[PDB]
Amino acid sequence: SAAEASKKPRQKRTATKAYNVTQAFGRRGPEQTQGNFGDQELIRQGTDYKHWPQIAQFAPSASAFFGMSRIGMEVTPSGTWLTYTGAIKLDDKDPNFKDQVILLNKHIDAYKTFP
Amino acid sequence: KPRQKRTATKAYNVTQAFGRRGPEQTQGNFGDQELIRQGTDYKHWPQIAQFAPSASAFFGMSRIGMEVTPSGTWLTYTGAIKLDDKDPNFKDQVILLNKHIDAYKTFP
């Protein structure tokens, strides 16, 4: 999958065991446009991760990405970039709210705790 | 239906699904009057949607945070997506995105 999955625009890629989060989206890190999400289990597995559906329930649809987010455009020496920022509210009345918080905390900035 | 999974259409438009356009943190700023009224029925929706991230890429590319605020618990996200200037459609993609970014500021 790697050679062919890598053919897609970055924002359309799907990470898997055969093409993991690092190969698709770069090493995790603190920099302003590095991704910071994923512990070692998610990084090596991507959408093969056992709880990927419980994570993906927070990812936005295309309509919601463009309806919810603050969208910008920056023209720089490296090219033309679409910038995005936003926030998705967790439903504290969802019976699984506490598990969702635990799941997100499991992966946010997790790279800080391993090489 | 969780806000992040909604899909806007002429019958259930961007305002109805996602709120009025505006400048504040949890408000969206994207879409002129036509896009707001039509959502994914907008004539150039597929050309906009090609920049929306897959679920894998949203969590792979973005800086993700979680915050408790005076209104509750939020997942925050930021990132940047590079347009492909080798794409013959590049010039039109820039025009299209530029047309909708902060369009509400000039609503007549």
Swiss-Prot record, chain A:
Segments carrying motif Nuclear localization signal: 7-15
Cite the post-translational modification comment. ADP-ribosylated. The ADP-ribosylation is retained in the virion during infection.
Q: Which residues form the CoV N CTD domain?
A: 1-115
Q: Region entry Dimerization: which residue ranges?
A: 9-112
Region listing for Putative NLRP3 binding, in residue ranges: 11-91
Q: Where in the cell is it found?
A: Virion; Host cytoplasm; Secreted; Host extracellular space
What the record says about family reads: Belongs to the betacoronavirus nucleocapsid protein family.
Write out the function statement from the record.
Packages the positive strand viral genome RNA into a helical ribonucleocapsid (RNP) and plays a fundamental role during virion assembly through its interactions with the viral genome and membrane protein M. Plays an important role in enhancing the efficiency of subgenomic viral RNA transcription as well as viral replication. Attenuates the stress granules formation by reducing host G3BP1 access to host mRNAs under stress conditions. May block host chemokine function in vivo, facilitating viral replication and transmission. Acts by being secreted into the extracellular space where it competes to host chemokines for binding to host glycosaminoglycans (GAG).
Task: Indicate the quaternary assembly.
Answer: Homodimer, homotetramer, homooligomer with RNA. Both monomeric and oligomeric forms interact with RNA. Interacts with protein M. Interacts with protein E. Interacts with NSP3; this interaction serves to tether the genome to the newly translated replicase-transcriptase complex at a very early stage of infection. Interacts with host NLRP3 and ABHD8; these interactions disrupt the association between NLRP3 and ABHD8, increasing NLRP3 stability, ultimately leading to increased inflammasome activation.
Q: Would you tell me the protein name for this molecule?
A: Nucleoprotein
UniProt source species: Severe acute respiratory syndrome coronavirus 2
Instruction: Give the shown range, full length included.
Output: 250 to 364 of 419
